């Protein structure tokens, strides 16, 4: 048995951190966001 001094549970707080490597684009779920333009065969106002 080894009794060791630890940090009291009430003087620390677990905080969830979300780590990201880059900011997702506007049309993140779209494989081809350029197909709204390539399929505008009548024009756009």
């Amino acid at each position: 048995i080894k009794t060791a001094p630890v940090v009291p549970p009430t003087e620390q707080r677990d905080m969830v951190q979300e780590e990201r490597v880059g900011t997702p684009v506007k049309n993140a779920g779209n494989a081809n966001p350029a197909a709204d333009s390539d399929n505008a065969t009548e024009g756009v106002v």
Binding site: S37, G43, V44, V45
Partner: protein
Amino acid sequence: GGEAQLAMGLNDMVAQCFHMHGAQTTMLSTPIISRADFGVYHNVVTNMYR
């Protein structure tokens, strides 16, 4: 993307930048007083008569 705005650009350019000559110059027999610029040809009938 300005495809819809070129069609408006043509019709706005043509109306703004195209001028005809009216009946007075080309068809009607108006005197020089009403056919010609008054700031220059206001004494041209009097002097040509002289």
